[PDB]
Design a protein around this ligand. Structure first.
Ligand SMILES: [Mg+2]
Ligand SMILES: [Mg+2]
Ligand SMILES: [Mg+2]
Ligand SMILES: [Mg+2]
Ligand SMILES: [Mg+2]
Ligand SMILES: [Mg+2]
Ligand SMILES: [Mg+2]
Ligand SMILES: [Mg+2]
Ligand SMILES: [Mg+2]
Ligand SMILES: [Mg+2]
Ligand SMILES: [Mg+2]
Lengths: 68, 52, 180, 261, 150
RNA sequence: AAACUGCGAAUGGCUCAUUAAAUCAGUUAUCGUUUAUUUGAUAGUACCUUACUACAUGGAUAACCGUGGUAAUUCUAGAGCU
RNA sequence: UCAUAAUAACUUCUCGAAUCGCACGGCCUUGCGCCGGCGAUGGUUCAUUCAAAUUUCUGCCCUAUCAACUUUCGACGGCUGGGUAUUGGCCAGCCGUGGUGACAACGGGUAACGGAGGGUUAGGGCUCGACCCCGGAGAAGGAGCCUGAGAAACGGCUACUACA
């Protein structure tokens, strides 16, 4: 056929739009840019791998000098 | 303590008793005028109330 | 057999290497937490009395106070004990610990100075290490600086000057967060 | 089974919630509260599936976060809060009030009510006695407890609650000639007048009612909900809960359809 | 029932919370309130037997002068054994329906109940029993009334 | 950031080995018991302790600086602060 | 012998609030003076909700080349206690000798988790159901236990056996 049906949303203000619209549709419309992140498996491996470190896991090179 | 030094703590602990009272009086007095100035600001809003 | 000597008064610690056994004979058969004289250790230790605080075996197992044995024994360590850190509330895991009687088997002793002597140690008692922070409670500050009930303790508080990395602005001041 | 359950599987939810068998595997699982689990109206289901205000789950919990809508005059902050019979939900911003009440087919329906008279409720008492210190008290069907009641008020009656001060303004006795609505069983939505009551020693008595169309029916005492003696205090929905059979239901749908167009 | 004496055991049997040695003497109609023998009525149109009111027996399992209430289902049966001590066995018979063969067959079950010293029950008597709390491993019923024999 | 403390981790998911009045089904009961959480109501410390301060009590510990042991683990010792 | 009230006492014995943050007001003897509004983390008892454990009645395949079974060291019931969140032969003592069965007990087989239900049709039936819904049990095979309202838990611990 030659007819098409969809859904429409009309917002009162741009701030209410940006405050309520979902991220994936915002990326669809192009108003805001996408977030760059690593894969889910890499994130999961990092999170469970860092559970074996105790205190200030941001830098953990202090135990490299124990061997001399 | 690290922030101060031995001599510093020594004088601070050894400070004369009357000086403590003088410092307290000075602090209470300055607080008194600063509070009075806040009351003067309350008088300024009272003047705004009279204007309105 | 290594030695870890500590000075609580000056807040200083040092590690020494000892290879000659006849100097170390007099520590034997003593218990952890006992009193010993450091005179046989050397001329620089004359007039020194030391307290035995702990030690470690060559294999790495720690000593536990209250168990009398020269070998090591298995125990069911519960929560709140010394050499056990549970992974879950109420968890107990079976471990192996060495008795509290000193013997030739151990690798390192740790001990502290009880009474200062006439002579000085070249690298231990000549330095003092600043305490990182000061008291944080209102009662402690009041008793420490010897104030009275009403003296506006708020003004009297240690202040440390902190600065940013390289922004070029003036440093500011930080305070100990009185909680009472 | 090593404790109580915290999940409810879809395809096992009560039928009167009207949930589609497709589009997901789970159900809202309303949280614990003042109303029974079997016969309750979750707020998320009411707002999203009936009013169609929210498209899906994600914004449903965002909607409540502004505290715009309240029930019984008090704000509730859990999305799966069990609402029930006679409960009134008030939204000040739009300016209308709703009451959760059964229709003639046994499910919850939207029912507009006026703001001025939508500020009171009424509920049946479960037991009456004196509590600690000798103070009498009663508890209704919505977990409302009120101390120092009228001594004439007895069990199984119904009492009118102001909902702002919690004072006993008025009450209705449970006797013949009263107007009642059934709240449990298959006879959902009927309205009738109590004819007579006969009791059986040992529990589980039955009561006989009669509809406006000279119909006759019976139900348990635990399922009767008296709302007045005559001229019922609340506003009944369209149809007045008379349950015409399928013959007249089929006659009326074509009759109004042809009349309109 | 026939009991020679009430106190023929190691311990002393008495009703709990019933004060029996009072300095002041007061006469009251109430059973337990005044200090005399205590009894009540279970209900369901069941009348307290006369032997209970003036009897002296002590029983913690009797529905009368006891701490057991009668509540639940009420059953009927045929008595088959009454020759043990303070316990009876009843037999109940019914008919089961087999759908395929369109006819019935008879079946029966056996039940155990506690008998009070107020009643005297012999073989071939009609009885009515009522549910109660567990009194033993396999005793959950109490006799209430014995119908006259044919 | 880290860490102390609070809560959850007994929900979900998989399988049908054992089990023949055992499990289970429909129908009753708890006047024979326990119950996180949610919701609604609800507590004149009479004197102790004239007084201990009520305009408000008292000691540790984490994180942390720095020094170690074992080839080996989400193993740990002793020293100094809060 | 209920809810509740009253009297004479007791207790290694509880609770009756020394917690935390965002909004800025009123009086007068004008002193760091007094009073005063909404919310997080609690707390004694009652009511409610999610429940849980026990518990009344009836209903399960084939087999007699399975006809009597149960009480050594509880098997049926009575009494006095201990233990459990509570009843109860659940356990400890004393005293009676009981309980089920040809109306199929007891035992042996099951290539047996139970139910809602699937396949096949004049009607009556025969057969399947591990498996999307409800209930029960298990985490290689046995036992024991901490924390916690809730576990005899195994993505919790301890010990043995077999693998590793
Ligand atoms: Mg009843
Ligand atoms: Mg199988
Ligand atoms: Mg509460
Ligand atoms: Mg026989
Ligand atoms: Mg099997
Ligand atoms: Mg199945
Ligand atoms: Mg299942
Ligand atoms: Mg388990
Ligand atoms: Mg296990
Ligand atoms: Mg696993
Ligand atoms: Mg698990």
């Amino acid at each position: 056929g030659g007819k098409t049906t969809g859904f429409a949303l009309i917002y009162d203000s741009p701030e209410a739009l940006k405050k309520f619209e979902p991220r994936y549709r915002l990326v669809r419309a192009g108003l805001a840019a996408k977030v760059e992140k690593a894969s889910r498996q890499q994130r999961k491996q990092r999170k469970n791998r860092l559970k074996t470190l105790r205190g200030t896991a941001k830098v953990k090179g202090a135990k490299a000098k124990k061997e001399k | 303590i690290v922030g101060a030094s031995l001599e510093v703590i020594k004088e601070r602990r050894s400070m004369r008793p009357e000086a403590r009272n003088a410092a307290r009086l000075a602090a209470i007095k300055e607080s008194k005028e600063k509070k009075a100035a806040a009351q003067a600001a309350k008088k300024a809003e009272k003047a705004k109330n009279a204007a309105a | 057999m290594k030695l870890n000597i500590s000075h609580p008064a000056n807040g200083s610690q040092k590690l020494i290497e000892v290879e000659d056994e006849r100097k170390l004979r007099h520590f034997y058969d003593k218990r952890m937490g006992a009193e010993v004289a450091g005179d046989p250790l050397g001329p620089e230790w004359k007039g020194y009395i030391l307290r035995i605080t702990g030690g470690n075996d060559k294999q790495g197992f720690p000593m536990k106070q209250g168990v009398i044995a020269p070998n090591r024994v298995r125990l069911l360590l519960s929560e709140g004990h010394s050499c056990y850190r549970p992974r879950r509330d109420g968890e107990r895991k079976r471990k192996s610990v060495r008795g509290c009687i000193v013997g030739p088997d151990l690798s390192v002793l740790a001990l502290s100075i009880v009474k200062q002597g006439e002579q000085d140690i070249p690298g231990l008692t000549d330095v003092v290490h600043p305490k990182r922070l000061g008291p944080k409670r209102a009662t402690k500050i009041r008793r420490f600086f010897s104030l009275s009930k009403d003296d506006d303790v708020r003004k009297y508080v240690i202040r440390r000057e902190v600065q940013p990395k390289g922004e070029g602005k003036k440093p500011y001041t930080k305070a100990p967060r009185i909680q009472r | 089974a090593r404790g109580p359950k915290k999940h409810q599987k879809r395809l096992s939810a009560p039928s009167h919630w009207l949930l589609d068998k497709l589009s997901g595997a789970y159900a809202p699982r309303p949280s614990t509260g003042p109303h029974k689990l079997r016969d309750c109206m979750p707020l998320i289901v009411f707002v999203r599936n009936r009013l169609k205000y929210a498209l899906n789950y994600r914004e449903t919990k965002a909607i409540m976060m502004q505290r715009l809508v309240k029930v019984d005059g008090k704000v509730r902050t859990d999305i799966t809060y069990p609402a029930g019979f006679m409960d009134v939900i008030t939204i000040e911003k739009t300016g209308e009030n709703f009451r959760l009440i059964y229709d003639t087919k046994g499910r919850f329906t939207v029912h507009r009510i006026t703001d001025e008279e939508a500020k009171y409720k009424l509920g049946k008492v479960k037991r009456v006695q004196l509590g600690r210190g000798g103070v009498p008290f009663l508890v209704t069907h919505d977990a409302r407890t009120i101390r120092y009641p009228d001594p004439l008020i007895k069990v199984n009656d119904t009492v009118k609650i102001d909902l702002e001060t919690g004072k006993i303004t008025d009450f209705i006795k449970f006797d013949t000639g009263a107007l009642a609505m059934i709240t449990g069983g298959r006879n959902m939505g009927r309205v009738g007048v109590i004819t007579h009551r006969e009791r059986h020693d040992g529990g589980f008595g039955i009561v006989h009612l009669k509809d406006a169309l000279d119909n006759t029916f019976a139900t348990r005492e635990s399922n009767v909900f008296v709302i007045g003696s005559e001229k019922p205090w609340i506003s009944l929905p369209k149809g007045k809960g008379v349950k015409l059979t399928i013959a007249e239901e089929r006659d009326q749908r074509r009759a109004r359809a042809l009349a309109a167009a | 029932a026939t009991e020679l004496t009430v106190q023929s055991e190691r311990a002393f049997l008495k009703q709990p919370h019933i004060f029996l040695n009072s300095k002041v003497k007061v006469k009251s109609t109430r059973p337990g309130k005044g200090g005399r023998r205590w009894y009540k009525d279970v209900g369901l149109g069941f009348k307290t037997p006369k032997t209970a009111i003036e009897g002296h027996y002590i029983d913690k399992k009797c529905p009368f002068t006891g701490m057991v209430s009668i509540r639940g289902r009420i059953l009927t049966g045929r008595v088959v054994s009454t020759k043990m001590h303070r316990t009876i066995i009843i037999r109940r018979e019914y008919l089961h329906y087999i759908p395929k063969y369109n006819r019935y067959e008879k079946r029966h079950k056996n039940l155990a109940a506690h008998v009070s010293p107020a009643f005297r029950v012999e073989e071939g008597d009609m009885v009515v029993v009522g549910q109660c709390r567990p009194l033993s491993k396999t005793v959950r019923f109490n006799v209430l009334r014995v119908l006259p024999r044919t």
